[PDB]
Amino acid sequence: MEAILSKMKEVVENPNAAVKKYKSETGKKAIGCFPVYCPEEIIHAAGMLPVGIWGGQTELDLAKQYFPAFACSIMQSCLEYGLKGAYDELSGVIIPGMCDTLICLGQNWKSAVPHIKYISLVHPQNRKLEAGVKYLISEYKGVKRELEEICGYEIEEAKIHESIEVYNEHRKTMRDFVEVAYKHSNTIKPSIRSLVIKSGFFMRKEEHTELVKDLIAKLNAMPEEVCSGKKVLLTGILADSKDILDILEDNNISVVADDLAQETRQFRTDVPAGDDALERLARQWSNIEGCSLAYDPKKKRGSLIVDEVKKKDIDGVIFCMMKFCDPEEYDYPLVRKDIEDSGIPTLYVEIDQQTQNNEQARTRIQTFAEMMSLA
């Protein structure tokens, strides 16, 4: 798998080079997609490249002219990069209005980064009402219209259906990797598990698919493994920094499942059958479950996490809490209770892209790991 892992690392550590390469070879453009949910199938159908945008480790400077200190870490990073010019190879960006902070970012962007077209999109809360489906279809028609303004040609209905089968294929394959990885927990460390998944944001899905199938084939040709340490499930926005993942490994902790927005939330739910392309996409949003950004007065998130912990005999759950994220903060008390009431232990860890020090997380995680042991 060495050749495959080297390929993945390359694009993840040098995304700008990968984007220019796609433009030179294909002669087509690239569009950025901001966190949680965008309709990638539409960009894909035009022959364009959908690039994921998830912040990064940076100090703040230019952003201080637009945000005060209490905006969430990830969005502080995204704005700084934007103002510094790091996204200039892109022909536009979709910034969905999922929360107060994403809404305010789009509005500042309009006057702060004039040269990169901002495409608006707001998902409905009443997502299960037939009237809500209709509204989202109109929102997606807007997105299609503005993508055509950019590229200079029509995006055909037949092609959107085609890109949808492609994306469902990729979702099925990632779910296959999740199971195999769980069966080879000693070989697949937290750093490798993250790389395999995250690399899917920086290439065409059809390419990523062939790569993961290869690795799956290589892994099944190896004996199943008896975990030598402790098993965990991670939940929250994201956990991709080298720092936090090395600490996990230092305590011989293995990640065998997740409820992270950057990871399994993306491929957990498929797009349904239909004759109308945009209708199929809209009904996907109706179907999503177990996420802090998807309206649900019953809060099924806790229950879904318990079911999965039981299936895989997992030893604990770690809340990876994005600094100053209000939706995740609102969820925390009720979700934690459903998990602990079932008998499963939990840990709190702050995620900060501007960190500086990490001795706190270090001591805390060591205690958790020891405790899981004596249990």
Binding site: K110, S111, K134, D326
Partner: protein, 399 residues
């Protein structure tokens, strides 16, 4: 007079709700810019968590509730109105301003998206019906036809839920009457609170607007509100003729203040501004609850709730502040950076640059919170206002 009339009318709403609860009548909790017309048609009792939290905060009892919610696991980063409310439920009430638990919920996100998560939590923990009216943010200058159709359909769903909760049928004749009441009160709110703009000096202390506000929030569709605002108007107009007003101190400088007041300290703030001769005569809030539409027009009603100034693009937001400064004949602007409100805080820097450019006027600001006392510091407030006063005075020293 009007002062006492308005205060007595508020306490009456609370007393009516308790009486409703001890019998078999259902009571609701609602966000401050929800389509109240839909519940008044059923003669339902309805209360407002935002009003309660500001009220207990002014009596210095909010910190205790916040700390109860924080010990349950809720982060201090969350809105102070939300934490105060979480503590109230856990504590089983409070004594400085009590209110009964609800049997149903009414949520509209025109003011912000935090109320969505807040009300999700309440619905789950208490097992009660949540009524949701989703007004998605306007990026375009005009409300899209798709938004109009979506809201109207959501009006229908809300009515079906309310027939079940209340056990009564929707009455078209009665819907018309309520629409007429609401339309007159909207216009009386806008007229009365705009009077400071064209009067030198103003007939009232600017802070007074935030006491009157509670009435237009909790009883917008009621006849008693009509009669109360007519009384208030008579009084202000006479002040305009006699040179009287609730403002103590000489009105030397006229300003616009951005943001809602820090309730745990409002007493210190009033005395401090008057000390320096400062009074607020330009405001955006007269436009918050006007909510104008043509009677019997569903499309017009949808557009009105959609376009409350928290839910429109940054260009439009900016225009509101520009017009209030020029119309009020103001000498400067003073900004509240409110730790609770991300929606207002995360566009403040750009909005304040633009306004100063268009009008040529001086500005300054301070840090605080509407309900949590840990966020405000007297000394800072003092130094900041003094600095703005020195600049405004150097100006007229030239004129």
């Amino acid at each position: 007079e009007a002062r006492v009339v308005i205060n007595d009318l508020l306490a009456e709403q609370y007393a009516n709700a308790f009486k409703a609860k001890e019998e078999g009548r259902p009571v609701g909790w609602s966000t401050s810019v929800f389509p109240q017309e839909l519940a008044e048609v059923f003669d339902l009792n309805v209360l407002y968590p935002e009003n309660q939290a500001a009220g207990v905060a002014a009596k210095k009892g909010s910190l205790e509730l916040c700390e109860i919610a924080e010990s349950k696991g809720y982060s201090i980063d969350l809105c102070a109105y939300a934490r105060t409310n979480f503590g109230l439920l856990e504590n089983g009430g409070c004594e400085a301003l009590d209110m009964p638990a609800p049997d149903f919920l009414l949520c509209c996100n025109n003011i912000c998206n935090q109320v969505i998560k807040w009300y999700e939590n309440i619905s789950r923990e208490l097992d009660i019906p949540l009524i949701m009216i989703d007004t998605t943010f306007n990026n375009e200058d005009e409300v899209t036809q798709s938004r109009i159709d979506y809201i109207k359909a959501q009006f229908e769903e809300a009515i079906k839920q309310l027939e079940i909760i209340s056990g009564k049928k929707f009455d078209p004749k009665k819907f018309e009457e309520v629409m007429k009441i609401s339309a007159e009160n909207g216009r009386l709110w806008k007229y009365s609170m705009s009077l400071p703009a064209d009067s030198s000096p103003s007939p009232m202390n600017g802070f007074d607007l935030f006491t009157y506000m509670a009435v237009i929030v909790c009883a917008r569709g009621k006849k008693e509100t009509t009669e109360a605002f007519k009384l208030l108007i008579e009084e202000l107009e006479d002040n305009m003729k006699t040179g009287k007003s609730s403002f103590r101190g000489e009105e030397k400088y006229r300003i616009m203040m951005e943001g809602i007041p820090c309730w745990p300290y409002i007493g210190y703030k009033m005395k401090t501004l008057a000390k320096f001769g400062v009074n607020m005569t330009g405001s955006v809030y007269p436009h918050a609850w006007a909510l104008q539409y043509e009677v019997n027009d569903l499309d017009g009603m949808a557009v009105a709730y959609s376009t409350m100034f928290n839910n429109v693009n940054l260009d439009r937001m900016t225009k509101y502040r520009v017009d209030s400064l020029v119309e009020g004949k103001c000498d400067g602007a003073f900004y509240h950076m409110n730790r609770s409100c991300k929606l207002m805080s995360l566009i403040q820097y750009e909005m304040q640059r633009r306004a100063a450019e268009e009008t040529g006027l001086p500005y300054a600001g301070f840090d605080g919170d509407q309900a949590d006392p840990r966020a405000f510091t007297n000394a800072q407030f003092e130094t900041r206002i003094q600095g703005l006063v020195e600049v405004m005075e150097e100006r007229k020293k030239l004129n």
